[PDB]
Amino acid sequence: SHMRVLVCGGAGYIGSHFVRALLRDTNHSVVIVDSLVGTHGKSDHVETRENVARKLQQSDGPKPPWADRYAALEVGDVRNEDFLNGVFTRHGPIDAVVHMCAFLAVGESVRDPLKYYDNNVVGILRLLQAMLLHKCDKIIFSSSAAIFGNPTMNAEPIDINAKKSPESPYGESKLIAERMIRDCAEAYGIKGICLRYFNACGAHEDGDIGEHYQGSTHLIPIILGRVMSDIAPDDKRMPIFGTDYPTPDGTCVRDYVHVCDLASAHILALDYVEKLGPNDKSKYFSVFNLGTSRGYSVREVIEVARKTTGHPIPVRECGRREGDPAYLVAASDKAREVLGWKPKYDTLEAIMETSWKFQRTHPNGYA
Amino acid sequence: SHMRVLVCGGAGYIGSHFVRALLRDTNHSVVIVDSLVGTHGKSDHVETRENVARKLQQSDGPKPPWADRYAALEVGDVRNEDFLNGVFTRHGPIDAVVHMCAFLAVGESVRDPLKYYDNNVVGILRLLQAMLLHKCDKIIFSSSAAIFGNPTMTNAEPIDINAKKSPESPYGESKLIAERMIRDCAEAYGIKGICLRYFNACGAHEDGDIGEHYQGSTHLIPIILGRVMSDIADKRMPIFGTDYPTPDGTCVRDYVHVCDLASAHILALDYVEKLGPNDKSKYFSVFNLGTSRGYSVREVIEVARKTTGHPIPVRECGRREGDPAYLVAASDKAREVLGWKPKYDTLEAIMETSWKFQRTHPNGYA
Numbered sequence A: 001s002h003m004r005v006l007v008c009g010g011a012g013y014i015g016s017h018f019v020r021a022l023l024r025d026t027n028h029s030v031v032i033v034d035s036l037v038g039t040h041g042k043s044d045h046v047e048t049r050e051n052v053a054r055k056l057q058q059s060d061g062p063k064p065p066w067a068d069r070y071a072a073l074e075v076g077d078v079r080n081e082d083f084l085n086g087v088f089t090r091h092g093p094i095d096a097v098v099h100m101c102a103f104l105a106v107g108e109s110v111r112d113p114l115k116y117y118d119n120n121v122v123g124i125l126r127l128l129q130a131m132l133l134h135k136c137d138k139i140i141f142s143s144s145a146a147i148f149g150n151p152t153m154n155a156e157p158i159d160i161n162a163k164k165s166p167e168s169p170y171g172e173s174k175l176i177a178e179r180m181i182r183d184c185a186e187a188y189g190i191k192g193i194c195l196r197y198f199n200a201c202g203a204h205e206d207g208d209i210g211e212h213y214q215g216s217t218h219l220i221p222i223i224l225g226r227v228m229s230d231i232a233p234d235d236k237r238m239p240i241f242g243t244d245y246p247t248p249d250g251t252c253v254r255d256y257v258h259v260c261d262l263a264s265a266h267i268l269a270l271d272y273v274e275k276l277g278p279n280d281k282s283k284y285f286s287v288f289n290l291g292t293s294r295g296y297s298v299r300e301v302i303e304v305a306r307k308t309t310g311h312p313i314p315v316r317e318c319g320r321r322e323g324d325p326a327y328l329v330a331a332s333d334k335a336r337e338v339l340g341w342k343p344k345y346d347t348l349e350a351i352m353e354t355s356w357k358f359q360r361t362h363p364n365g366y367a
Numbered sequence B: 001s002h003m004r005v006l007v008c009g010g011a012g013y014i015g016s017h018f019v020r021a022l023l024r025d026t027n028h029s030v031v032i033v034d035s036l037v038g039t040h041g042k043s044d045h046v047e048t049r050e051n052v053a054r055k056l057q058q059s060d061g062p063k064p065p066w067a068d069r070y071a072a073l074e075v076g077d078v079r080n081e082d083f084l085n086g087v088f089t090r091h092g093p094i095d096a097v098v099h100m101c102a103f104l105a106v107g108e109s110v111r112d113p114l115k116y117y118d119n120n121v122v123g124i125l126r127l128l129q130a131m132l133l134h135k136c137d138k139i140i141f142s143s144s145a146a147i148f149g150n151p152t153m154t155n156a157e158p159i160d161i162n163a164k165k166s167p168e169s170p171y172g173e174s175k176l177i178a179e180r181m182i183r184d185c186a187e188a189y190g191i192k193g194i195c196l197r198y199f200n201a202c203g204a205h206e207d208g209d210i211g212e213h214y215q216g217s218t219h220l221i222p223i224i225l226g227r228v229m230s231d232i233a234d235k236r237m238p239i240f241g242t243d244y245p246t247p248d249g250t251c252v253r254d255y256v257h258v259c260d261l262a263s264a265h266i267l268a269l270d271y272v273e274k275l276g277p278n279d280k281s282k283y284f285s286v287f288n289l290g291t292s293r294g295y296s297v298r299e300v301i302e303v304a305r306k307t308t309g310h311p312i313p314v315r316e317c318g319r320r321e322g323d324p325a326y327l328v329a330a331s332d333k334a335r336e337v338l339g340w341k342p343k344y345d346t347l348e349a350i351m352e353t354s355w356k357f358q359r360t361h362p363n364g365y366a
């Protein structure tokens, strides 16, 4: 069911996996708008017309059914209202917006709130205003488990409607965005879906795209980066942020969901909003928690990395990183029931293997 | 305590009363920044150097202690970076910011959320960024009872500062996010902030020269008094919703005089100015400002009838979306910590000042 999709932040980690799924599993037209602030100012990995061509060229073998599928790339900031307007006009009519751009280092948001409120909140504001101006009535928003925080001061899978008590400015910025999108449904008829990803991880089976460790603030990429340093010719120990949490082993528990499963959820979300009609209205705004429903502590994740890489990965216990909730695991019944979401990755072992395959073949990232 | 104060939205209804209190009851320097979007693009009422000299000229009798006091006026949008930065630079150093600008029609925020999220949220964001850039560490923010919304399922009692926040409108959401942004700036940059939740602002300065004119107003009392004016200077007074979970079915509110709100800001300014390195836990504070008395829409109209002597015919209508059923304030902390002492209690006295201003201003300030 062809549809022209505008993917903000599409050159990023999760965005690249979503775009690839759009290009290989759908007939939608893809337009990416990214400032490249989260990609070191480069876009060699983006599946533009030229990049896709070079890939099919440099390599030999049966031409894939998606060999001619590519996305357009518009480089700029979504807060630059002029730039944004030009993108909607030149690539219009835009049927749906998938808003993935943001700053997402929870620890950094606590130290520099304004950087996060500006980019995260003003960014979604500008998109919503552009959608209204250009008659676009469908949006899929990248939310987070960070909107939940710790229980109001049993730890079990978090439901979509659990209380929202953000433990960081990052979480607050995602939460206000959901409120804004919700209010636009009632006021302007904008159909929106907020997908709360939990801990995104893994890499596409092809092993060519993923989250490089250099400059990363996330657990697994950092662990694998320590291995990339243990592999190199002779403190390289793996830092554990906080061991005094209200969890079984004292370290934070998270739900690691594969980026390819997150990608398929967006395709299902797009089909859902596209089928909504005027009688649905109460269904114009919906939220879904995306996770495997299984949790792993920081210690357990490191142990899986050790068994996946075959390396020692010496650790070192440190103090808590401000902004971190003790436990964040997802209950995804709504996503499974309503969207028909069917995650292919369940164990961290299989996920970790795809992350390692990508990292171990990219000592310098995409560079 | 000679402090230079930047008052955003200072040309407005509540801002004008706060500025007058600053000029007559303090020795602070006042700089007003306002786009005049809420004042019909005019500022004849603002107590600038010129406007104040005209009052003096027309006045007969000995000069008051505050005869020559005036405020500077910078006309522009706080969301305009170049403009805001220029104001901080030319009038600097700015010691404290009193952020009063915003759009505040609860009913309109439900119909047009983006207009409110933009102005209300981006406005406070720019001010906080400017404060950081220009080394300003003190801010007093105009919050609202709208951040509370309805109670989660009893006994309807005055609302405590830490009651659950369940905004019933985008307007309430915009005020709430501003409080969380200010709070996070305390922890991160050492910015000392106070969020004053005004409840239903009403009344007018005893002088009878400034207030909220009915033409273009979305608020209850100004609209009621406007119905009295139109008849003299349907045409029936509309009651929005009569099926609310209240004693008489209409919304209950806490009407607090703008002059009492003004004195609370002066007390708030003193509170943040006295904060030091040891008072980290006090860098972010919130206070609910109300009389603790509630009046339903029916009761307010009843008071207006007696105050004006006009029949004020009515027509019951449906609910205005975005309205909580009950909003009355418990002001224990404001009284205990700031030493706030409201001079107006009952609505009769308040209504009297509102009527005095309106009846003498058939065309507003025009």
Ligand SMILES: NC(=O)c1ccc[n+]([C@@H]2O[C@H](COP(=O)([O-])OP(=O)(O)OC[C@H]3O[C@@H](n4cnc5c(N)ncnc54)[C@H](O)[C@@H]3O)[C@@H](O)[C@H]2O)c1
Pocket: A008, A009, A010, A011, A012, A013, A014, A015, A033, A034, A035, A036, A037, A038, A039, A076, A077, A078, A079, A099, A100, A101, A102, A103, A104, A119, A123, A142, A143, A144, A145, A196, A197, A198, A199, A200, A201
């Ligand atoms: N990574 C996770 O575990 C996780 C979990 C929950 C939610 N999320 C959310 O998913 C989205 C994507 O995350 P990611 O891991 O792919 O991160 P990422 O940084 O790789 O992707 C974000 C992309 O957005 C771009 N961007 C940022 N601000 C922009 C702006 N103002 N204008 C244009 N482009 C801009 C960046 O250049 C980057 O390419 C974000 O909204 C993030 O908050 C991520």
Ligand SMILES: NC(=O)c1ccc[n+]([C@@H]2O[C@H](COP(=O)([O-])OP(=O)(O)OC[C@H]3O[C@@H](n4cnc5c(N)ncnc54)[C@H](O)[C@@H]3O)[C@@H](O)[C@H]2O)c1
Pocket: B008, B009, B010, B011, B012, B013, B014, B015, B033, B034, B035, B036, B037, B038, B039, B076, B077, B078, B079, B099, B100, B101, B102, B103, B104, B119, B123, B142, B143, B144, B145, B197, B198, B199, B200, B201, B202
């Ligand atoms: N009136 C009430 O009952 C009430 C209750 C609770 C909270 N508040 C808050 O108190 C404050 C003042 O309310 P008021 O009744 O005096 O309203 P008002 O409209 O008279 O005052 C607001 C002033 O801010 C200005 N303004 C708006 N956006 C601006 C911008 N972007 N840049 C520069 N100036 C801008 C307007 O021109 C206006 O002069 C607002 O923040 C309002 O939300 C009012």
Ligand SMILES: O=c1ccn([C@@H]2O[C@H](COP(=O)(O)OP(=O)(O)O)[C@@H](O)[C@H]2O)c(=O)[nH]1
Pocket: A106, A199, A217, A218, A219, A220, A222, A239, A240, A241, A242, A252, A253, A254, A298, A321, A324
């Ligand atoms: O070097 C690191 C990086 C992260 N973490 C922890 O691993 C968990 C996941 O952190 P991440 O930044 O990868 O994602 P988040 O849960 O903040 O969205 C959290 O408890 C972090 O404190 C850690 O112990 N050491």
Ligand SMILES: O=c1ccn([C@@H]2O[C@H](COP(=O)(O)OP(=O)(O)O)[C@@H](O)[C@H]2O)c(=O)[nH]1
Pocket: B106, B200, B218, B219, B220, B221, B223, B238, B239, B240, B241, B251, B252, B253, B297, B320, B323
């Ligand atoms: O013409 C009007 C205007 C307002 N109201 C009601 O009076 C109460 C106060 O409304 P207002 O806009 O003056 O202030 P708010 O409580 O929204 O901050 C609310 O229940 C309104 O619905 C009314 O019944 N008729």
